Amino acid sequence: GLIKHTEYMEFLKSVPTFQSLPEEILSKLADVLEETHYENGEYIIRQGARGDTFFIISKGTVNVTREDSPSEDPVFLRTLGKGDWFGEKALQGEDVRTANVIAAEAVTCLVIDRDSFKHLIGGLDDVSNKAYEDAEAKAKYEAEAAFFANLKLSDFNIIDTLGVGGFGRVELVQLKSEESKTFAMKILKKRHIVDTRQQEHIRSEKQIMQGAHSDFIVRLYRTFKDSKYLYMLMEACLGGELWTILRDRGSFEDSTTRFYTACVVEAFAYLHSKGIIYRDLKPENLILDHRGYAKLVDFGFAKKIGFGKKTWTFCGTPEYVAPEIILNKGHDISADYWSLGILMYELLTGSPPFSGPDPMKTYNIILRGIDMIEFPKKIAKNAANLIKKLCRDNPSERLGNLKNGVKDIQKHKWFEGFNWEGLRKGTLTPPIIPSVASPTDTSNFDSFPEDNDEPPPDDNSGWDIDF
Ligand SMILES: Nc1cc(C(=O)O)ccc1CN1CCC[C@H](O[C@H](CO)c2cc(Cl)cc(Cl)c2)[C@@H]1c1ccccc1
């Protein structure tokens, strides 16, 4: 019906999830959705029954209940109303109903069975599948956040240590209910953060790392907190630290360094797309997963900046600080292209190019520039040429900040023959293949002694409110 199709259309444009979708999808949905009516107390879905239908509530309210066992009272889960929906798993295949949906008053639902939804999905356009992916990604992450929001620290067990410092430590943890699932738990002493004045640094680290979805960045699922520590639940990358592998090997070959530099270029293309400066690039910030792919791990100095704006915080290890940071001229994402040049040089030779006996002396040699360095014979011509373009003194003139952004780095002669697409798909063979026997294998990390020392003092000031 023309009227009914427009009423369905105007109703679908009022639902927060469906309104982003194109007109083709919303119109084709309106062409096949059908109305079903219920009354107060009537069961729409019964737990344990089989089903092949998804419901969108267009009028009234429903009570969602469930029983954990046959000899137990039903536990009330939630109440849903106009614009909400339920029964979606019946579209994806699984028929058994895991909860009752009972009408709280007179209800109308717009329904679409499994076969109709499948037939609608089966024949669609190429543009029609692109905004569908954005909405599927958005709801796939909100569902991930909800899975982790249910968990507590008491649901995990410590396996072994991955790293130790003044900050605290990084532990390989296993989820008690699923032994195939292991994570890297970074446990920070709140006292060390307060003594170093990193309250806002750790606060933006949580915001950046959780919102980031890149295969070249370590995921941060959630955080926890208690009176002494902050806990950051991350993706376990069991291939090992790039700094220990670099230490063990001395330096990396040209092709080896190229694959790791390419991993950082992808991570930076993603961060720079969101207006985020990384600022902490060095071999210690890279970790290999079980395949040998490299990912950025630490977002302590990272910062969300506005398009066309600069920042002025003097931060970082002196050898990796860009000249505009030393000179207090303000900096943006182009300080990461400088860092990329420093990383290439250290990975190819075992040492970064600029280093004095203290910070001030290191800053003095940086201000002298990359054209004042005698490049080792070890560094290939194309690699030396790319380093000099990445480490141009003026950030405006720096490669990656020119006409085509990061594409100017990707198109450089050093990367000729490099399969960027194969790297993004995960089919490019990495240069060092780590040996990982299981999710609990920590043999690619150094051994750490257990911490026998006293716990740090309690910190009950509410700067950690969001953790
Ligand atoms: N939450 C979540 C978790 C996961 C995961 O766990 O991986 C995956 C997906 C989602 C998002 N998903 C949830 C259910 C409702 C909707 O999806 C159904 C098809 O199931 C649907 C019904 C109609 Cl009538 C019309 C359209 Cl366009 C879609 C929505 C969705 C929203 C937009 C696009 C696709 C799906």
Domains and CATH numbers, the chain: 2-149 (2.60.120.10), 150-235 (3.30.200.20), 240-426 (1.10.510.10)
How many angstroms separate the alpha carbon of residue 311 from the centre of ligand 1?
40
Q: How far apart are CA 209 and CA 298, in angstroms?
A: 9
From 13, 33, 34, 88, the mutation candidate for ligand 1 (largest count of ligand atoms within 8 A of CB) is: 88
104: Cβ contacts below 8 Å, ≥ 6 apart: 40, 60, 61, 62, 63, 79
Task: Classify the C-alpha dihedral 399-288-322-362 as positive or negative.
Answer: negative
Active site residue 280: yes
The one-letter amino acid code at 265 reads: V
132: Cβ contacts below 8 Å, ≥ 6 apart: 21, 25
Closest CA to 431 of 418, 446, 440: 418
For the stretch 74-97, what's the b/e string if a residue is b when 16 or more beta carbons lie within 10 angstroms of its beta carbon?
A: eeeeeebeeeeebbeebbeeeeeb
Q: How far apart are CA 156 and CA 177, in angstroms?
A: 9
146: Cβ contacts below 8 Å, ≥ 6 apart: none
Q: How far apart are CA 284 and CA 105, in angstroms?
A: 60
Token pair in block for residue 41: 């107390």
How many angstroms separate the alpha carbon of residue 136 from the centre of ligand 1?
6
The verdict on whether residue 437 carries a ligand-binding annotation is no
Q: Report which protein residue has its CA nearest ligand 1's atom 10.
A: 139
460: Cβ contacts below 8 Å, ≥ 6 apart: 227
The verdict on whether residue 97 carries a ligand-binding annotation is yes
How many residues make up the chain in this entry?
A: 467
Closest CA to 351 of 244, 250, 280, 259: 250
Q: Which atom of ligand 1 is nearest to the CA of 21?
A: 27
| DSSP reduced 3-state for 178 | strand
CB-side neighbour CA atoms (13 Å) of 296:
33
Token pair in block for residue 123: 């024949």
Residue 400 near residue 391 (C-beta atoms within 8 A): no
Distance of CA 441 to the CA centre of its chain: 23
Q: How far apart are CA 193 and CA 204, in angstroms?
A: 13
Residue 38 forms beta bridges with which residues?
Answer: 107
The verdict on whether residue 294 carries a ligand-binding annotation is no
CB-side neighbour CA atoms (13 Å) of 406:
18
How many angstroms separate the alpha carbon of residue 22 from the centre of ligand 1?
15
Phi/psi at 45 (5° precision): -125, 140
Catalytic residue among 68, 248, 280, 289: 280
Q: Report which protein residue has its CA nearest ligand 1's atom 34.
A: 136
Q: How far apart are CA 93 and CA 334, in angstroms?
A: 48
Local structure of residue 293 (DSSP, 8 states): -
Distance of CA 445 to the CA centre of its chain: 23
Residue 271 near residue 264 (C-beta atoms within 8 A): no
CB-side neighbour CA atoms (13 Å) of 448:
18
436-439 contacts at long range (C-beta below 8 A, 24 or more positions apart) = 436/238, 436/239, 436/290, 439/174, 439/179, 439/180, 439/181, 439/182, 439/236, 439/238
How many angstroms separate the alpha carbon of residue 201 from the centre of ligand 1?
35
First-last CA distance in the chain: 51
Residue 60 near residue 104 (C-beta atoms within 8 A): yes
| Ligand 1 pocket residues where CB is under 6 Å | 17, 21, 25, 29, 54, 85, 88, 91, 112, 132, 135-136, 139-140, 143
Q: How far apart are CA 16 and CA 425, in angstroms?
A: 32
Q: How far apart are CA 45 and CA 111, in angstroms?
A: 12
Structure determined by: X-ray
